[PDB]
Amino acid sequence: MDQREILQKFLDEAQSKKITKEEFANEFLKLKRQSTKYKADKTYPTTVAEKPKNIKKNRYKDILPYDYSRVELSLITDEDSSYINANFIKGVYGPKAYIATQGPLSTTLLDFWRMIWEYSVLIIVMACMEYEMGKKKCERYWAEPGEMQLEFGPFSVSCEAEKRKSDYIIRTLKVKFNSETRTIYQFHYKNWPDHDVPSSIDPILELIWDVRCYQEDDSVPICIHCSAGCGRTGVICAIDYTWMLLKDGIIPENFSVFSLIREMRTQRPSLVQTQEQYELVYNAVLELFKRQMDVIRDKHSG
Numbered sequence: 001m002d003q004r005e006i007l008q009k010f011l012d013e014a015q016s017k018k019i020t021k022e023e024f025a026n027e028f029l030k031l032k033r034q035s036t037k038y039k040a041d042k043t044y045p046t047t048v049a050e051k052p053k054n055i056k057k058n059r060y061k062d063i064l065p066y067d068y069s070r071v072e073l074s075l076i077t078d079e080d081s082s083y084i085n086a087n088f089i090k091g092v093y094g095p096k097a098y099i100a101t102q103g104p105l106s107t108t109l110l111d112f113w114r115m116i117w118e119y120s121v122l123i124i125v126m127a128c129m130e131y132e133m134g135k136k137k138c139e140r141y142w143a144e145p146g147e148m149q150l151e152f153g154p155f156s157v158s159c160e161a162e163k164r165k166s167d168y169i170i171r172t173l174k175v176k177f178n179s180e181t182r183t184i185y186q187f188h189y190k191n192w193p194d195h196d197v198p199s200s201i202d203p204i205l206e207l208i209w210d211v212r213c214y215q216e217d218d219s220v221p222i223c224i225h226c227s228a229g230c231g232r233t234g235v236i237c238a239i240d241y242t243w244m245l246l247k248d249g250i251i252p253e254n255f256s257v258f259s260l261i262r263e264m265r266t267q268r269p270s271l272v273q274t275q276e277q278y279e280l281v282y283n284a285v286l287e288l289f290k291r292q293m294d295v296i297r298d299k300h301s302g
């Protein structure tokens, strides 16, 4: 089939059969079930993350990176100085399109910039606040205007500009290391779409759009984090992936939101952690298909 046909089918299929909360529940339960079998089978060890030297570098003891996809550090390499709670996530064309990680600890702030630097990351997407439900969900790794430089080891970070949008902030950062200066764009998403508001998914689509404005390709990975580096981090990731497919006309005929999330959850534990976040992905994806079908229609009008 061709893109228009595959998109029309997904569109029609959804219309002719709305999914229900219970079906969503049933779907998501299967995903969690697969994780169980994978555990029992020892398919994705987390040996490195469980090492004593690394325990204190994990924000959530239950959330550890699979050995096979964990991001390795080699910049200014102590013997366990190579570990960070982060996993490479594959893009549509190849691997290492994204790096899903945790909101850094005061103890791993130096590790965070090492990684961002060792992989020439240009974009960081933060999907949480510093404080949530009265708890500290992320240490300050960025810099704000008027603050000058902040120091994390040999790293000097400062903020040149800040673009304030409705639900997020875009901080233009200047990172210096060894007489070299790079520009990093931090996207701080200080809100989240609401389950009871179909339109509330619009802000997240605008976020990813802007991001993609700053990097359309997959030359370097895009770093995405929340607090655990799973949940919201997975949603943004799943949508970007699905959108990249739509934009480049390569939506496999056998495409399902279900398979997508399944693929992701085998690259990072609980990348999309809840049924609510699963539904948001389904809803957001659907909207993307409609917008893409429109593009197909206006190009068919030549």
Ligand SMILES: O=C(COc1ccc(-c2oc3cc(O)c(C(=O)O)cc3c2C#Cc2cccc(Cl)c2)cc1)NC1CC1
Residues within 6 Å of the ligand: 059, 060, 061, 062, 063, 128, 226, 227, 228, 229, 230, 231, 232, 233, 273, 274
């Ligand atoms: O490490 C711990 C403490 O337990 C935990 C407490 C909270 C979380 C947790 O952090 C998050 C951070 C996020 O940033 C998002 C997020 O993306 O929103 C979601 C969660 C989330 C979550 C969740 C969640 C809540 C209810 C139901 C389900 Cl299925 C998941 C994870 C683990 N215990 C170890 C002894 C074993």
